[PDB]
Design an enzyme around this catalytic site. Sequence first.
Site, short mmCIF file in Angstrom:
data_model
loop_
_atom_site.label_atom_id
_atom_site.label_comp_id
_atom_site.label_asym_id
_atom_site.label_seq_id
_atom_site.Cartn_x
_atom_site.Cartn_y
_atom_site.Cartn_z
N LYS A 36 0.89 -1.18 0.00
CA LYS A 36 0.00 0.00 0.00
C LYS A 36 0.90 1.20 0.00
CE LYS A 36 -4.56 -0.23 1.77
NZ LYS A 36 -5.43 0.86 2.27
N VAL A 37 0.46 2.30 -0.55
CA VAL A 37 1.06 3.59 -0.13
C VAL A 37 -0.07 4.49 0.38
CG1 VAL A 37 1.44 4.21 -2.62
CG2 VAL A 37 2.42 5.62 -0.81
N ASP A 150 13.94 2.57 -14.21
CA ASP A 150 12.47 2.54 -14.34
C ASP A 150 11.94 3.98 -14.36
OD1 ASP A 150 9.85 1.13 -14.51
OD2 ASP A 150 9.72 1.57 -12.33
C1 KHC Z 1 1.74 9.07 -4.75
N1 KHC Z 1 3.00 8.33 -4.61
C2 KHC Z 1 3.23 7.01 -4.95
C3 KHC Z 1 4.52 6.67 -4.64
C4 KHC Z 1 5.14 7.82 -4.06
C5 KHC Z 1 6.38 8.07 -3.47
C6 KHC Z 1 6.64 9.30 -2.88
C7 KHC Z 1 5.66 10.29 -2.87
CL1 KHC Z 1 5.97 11.75 -2.00
C8 KHC Z 1 4.43 10.08 -3.47
CL2 KHC Z 1 3.21 11.30 -3.38
C9 KHC Z 1 4.16 8.85 -4.06
C10 KHC Z 1 5.07 5.27 -4.89
C11 KHC Z 1 6.53 5.19 -4.91
N2 KHC Z 1 7.66 5.04 -4.92
C12 KHC Z 1 4.48 4.88 -6.27
C13 KHC Z 1 4.83 3.42 -6.57
C14 KHC Z 1 5.03 3.02 -8.02
N3 KHC Z 1 4.69 4.08 -8.96
C15 KHC Z 1 5.38 5.32 -8.63
C16 KHC Z 1 4.89 5.92 -7.33
N4 KHC Z 1 3.02 4.97 -6.09
C17 KHC Z 1 2.37 5.96 -5.44
O1 KHC Z 1 1.16 5.88 -5.23
#
Ligand code: KHC
Length: 339
Positions: A36-37, A150
């Site tokens: 999850k993030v 990537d």
């Molecule tokens: C919205 N987002 C997301 C990631 C972030 C990493 C750092 C930050 Cl500050 C944000 Cl906002 C991110 C994740 C990473 N690394 C990924 C994971 C894979 N795709 C790139 C961003 N997914 C997000 O939802």
Amino acid sequence: RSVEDDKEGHLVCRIGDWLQERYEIVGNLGEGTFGKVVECLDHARGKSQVALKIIRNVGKYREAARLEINVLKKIKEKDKENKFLCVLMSDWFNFHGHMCIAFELLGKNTFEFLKENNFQPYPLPHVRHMAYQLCHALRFLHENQLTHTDLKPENILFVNSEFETLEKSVKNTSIRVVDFGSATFDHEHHTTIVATRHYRPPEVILELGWAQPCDVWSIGCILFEYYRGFTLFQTHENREHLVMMEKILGPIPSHMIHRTRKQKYFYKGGLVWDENSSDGRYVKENCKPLKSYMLQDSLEHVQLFDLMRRMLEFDPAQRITLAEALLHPFFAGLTPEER
Ligand SMILES: Cn1c2c(c3ccc(Cl)c(Cl)c31)[C@H](C#N)C1(CCNCC1)NC2=O
Ligand SMILES: [K+]
């Protein structure tokens, strides 16, 4: 208080839960087969905003993220003045098997924005400023025995994606690079196939080794995409992709053919391609020499296309370095501030 995992190794948690009696979840931002993030309040930095990456309790995802964290450490160690546009990691812990990595909240990714604007392209001034940030950041990364592997529009986020109306323009062209989950040190096991399809260079497809030149191609591809609003290499099969490259870019160097274990795609030194066949008519119509995609004749644009072509050299040994890119006369067009 006691936490719990699901049948698949995901931490059970929704909006309103705490971790470390410190971080409060208040948003969902992303999901996947990594975990999850979630958006949180760092209730031990006066409730400031963080993206928390929470990884599944599984051997391979957990070891993958041990290395993700080593990379983020090296970066924080090297970019003390905070100037090299790679996402700052504020924290990281093993939560009951789950690795968690907190970062500074950032805005939309340069993909989300583009599609929210109906796939109309960034002005060239914007293309220039972003190209510059990108060249600046990965040069930093490349003088540190690292390769990202990537790069794509999804992995580049606006500090602040507030837009104006005109068709939309981003008020602020500041971007961060993100997702060091694939990044490899010069001394460690290079995964073979690497990068997402569109942003993938030839030496990877031909399985000929890769290093930093991998990311420069990714960037060349991304700039084409910022400039036109649509991908350079709109395919999902290795043979068509190599044919599009040859039609957009020129003949593959014969030494790269002599060397590739991928002989299946070649007969007597030529790629196997049916020009007069469904997929033919399409690539004939659509895949044209790089200079054909120029939307204006003026200098800025010509200066752009020369950089893109240099970023898109077949021989990785020939391709422009980002240290070189930084000196390119495309980047004479930059303001003092943008510099
Ligand atoms: C919205 N987002 C997301 C990631 C972030 C990493 C750092 C930050 Cl500050 C944000 Cl906002 C991110 C994740 C990473 N690394 C990924 C994971 C894979 N795709 C790139 C961003 N997914 C997000 O939802
Ligand atoms: K795709």
